[PDB]
Design an enzyme around this catalytic site. Sequence first.
Site, PDB file in Angstrom:
ATOM      1  N   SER A 104       0.803  -1.233   0.000  1.00  0.00           N
ATOM      2  CA  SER A 104       0.000   0.000   0.000  1.00  0.00           C
ATOM      3  C   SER A 104       0.841   1.292   0.000  1.00  0.00           C
ATOM      4  O   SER A 104       0.843   2.059   0.975  1.00  0.00           O
ATOM      5  CB  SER A 104      -0.916   0.005   1.232  1.00  0.00           C
ATOM      6  OG  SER A 104      -1.665  -1.197   1.342  1.00  0.00           O
ATOM      7  N   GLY A 105       1.544   1.530  -1.101  1.00  0.00           N
ATOM      8  CA  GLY A 105       2.326   2.750  -1.272  1.00  0.00           C
ATOM      9  C   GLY A 105       1.776   3.558  -2.431  1.00  0.00           C
ATOM     10  O   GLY A 105       0.591   3.908  -2.432  1.00  0.00           O
ATOM     11  N   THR A 106       2.634   3.856  -3.412  1.00  0.00           N
ATOM     12  CA  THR A 106       2.202   4.464  -4.679  1.00  0.00           C
ATOM     13  C   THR A 106       1.587   3.371  -5.598  1.00  0.00           C
ATOM     14  O   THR A 106       0.642   3.633  -6.359  1.00  0.00           O
ATOM     15  CB  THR A 106       3.364   5.247  -5.344  1.00  0.00           C
ATOM     16  OG1 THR A 106       3.834   6.258  -4.437  1.00  0.00           O
ATOM     17  CG2 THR A 106       2.914   5.917  -6.638  1.00  0.00           C
TER      18      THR A 106
ATOM     19  N   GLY B 294       1.566  -1.406  -5.167  1.00  0.00           N
ATOM     20  CA  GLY B 294       1.687  -2.454  -4.146  1.00  0.00           C
ATOM     21  C   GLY B 294       2.975  -3.272  -4.173  1.00  0.00           C
ATOM     22  O   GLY B 294       3.026  -4.315  -3.517  1.00  0.00           O
TER      23      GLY B 294
ATOM     24  N   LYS C  41      10.420   1.015  -3.582  1.00  0.00           N
ATOM     25  CA  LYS C  41       9.483   0.611  -4.596  1.00  0.00           C
ATOM     26  C   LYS C  41      10.265  -0.255  -5.553  1.00  0.00           C
ATOM     27  O   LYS C  41      11.375   0.124  -5.909  1.00  0.00           O
ATOM     28  CB  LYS C  41       8.969   1.881  -5.278  1.00  0.00           C
ATOM     29  CG  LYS C  41       7.842   1.720  -6.292  1.00  0.00           C
ATOM     30  CD  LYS C  41       6.473   1.658  -5.638  1.00  0.00           C
ATOM     31  CE  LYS C  41       5.363   1.299  -6.633  1.00  0.00           C
ATOM     32  NZ  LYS C  41       4.814   2.442  -7.428  1.00  0.00           N
TER      33      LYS C  41
ATOM     34  N   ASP D  82      -1.067  13.768 -12.003  1.00  0.00           N
ATOM     35  CA  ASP D  82      -1.482  12.473 -11.461  1.00  0.00           C
ATOM     36  C   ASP D  82      -1.891  12.585  -9.973  1.00  0.00           C
ATOM     37  O   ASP D  82      -1.572  11.717  -9.138  1.00  0.00           O
ATOM     38  CB  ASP D  82      -0.383  11.418 -11.668  1.00  0.00           C
ATOM     39  CG  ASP D  82      -0.882   9.997 -11.457  1.00  0.00           C
ATOM     40  OD1 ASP D  82      -2.106   9.758 -11.616  1.00  0.00           O
ATOM     41  OD2 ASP D  82      -0.049   9.117 -11.128  1.00  0.00           O
TER      42      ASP D  82
END
Length: 267
Positions: free
Chosen positions: A26-28, A30, A47, A132
Amino acid sequence: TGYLTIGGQRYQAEINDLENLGEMGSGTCGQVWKMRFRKTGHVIAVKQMRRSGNDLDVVLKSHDCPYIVQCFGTFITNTDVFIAMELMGTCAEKLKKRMQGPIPERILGKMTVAIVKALYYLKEKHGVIHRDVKPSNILLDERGQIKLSDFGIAGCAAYMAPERIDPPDDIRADVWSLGISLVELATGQFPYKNCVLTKVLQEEPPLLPGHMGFSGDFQSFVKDCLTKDHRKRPKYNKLLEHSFIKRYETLEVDVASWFKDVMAKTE
């Protein structure tokens, strides 16, 4: 870039040197891990993404801004790309799914300040358009901090401003996404009929419900951001003098606590 900068000093390092401490979903996206850089002792996020067909290096010159999640550097292997960044709590997206309830105005108020100042910073200092702006890319944390996660350059991303259909050629499309995001979290429901989602350009912008007990100023701020003519829709510079901001700029709001408190659940 084979190089990692933290505490204001730049180190050579290698992705495989880092202590993996287990994953997060659960970041930018998964595909993100929590690790430690043995050399300074810091604990970070990493990431990890599979490599594709194919360089926006300059994410690290943005150390300046407290509302943008610090990036420490990047790594490449013949198979993936690792971007290393400061460790945070979760999306707002997660908070929404998790609470299955709305986010309080006052948290959104702090959020709103932080997300605007972030975007401003980018346009001014780095001539950037984030392009975004959505709840997935707004990270909160235990200490009460709120920050934008700069992802670089069927309800799948319907935060698009209605100004994207007159070619041929960006300034304040970001402002619209902002509004949509505010509406979404403030009400806990992505505004639009499920399919796909072409009411965007049809309808009157999906403003904030009149009697869920939101302030008028919040209501205003949301209307202003949600203007169909980009021509009329306000720049950051103006937003920042909107009173909603002026307010949450100054008002004590225990985000730290709220956030913690909302973490009394599974997930």
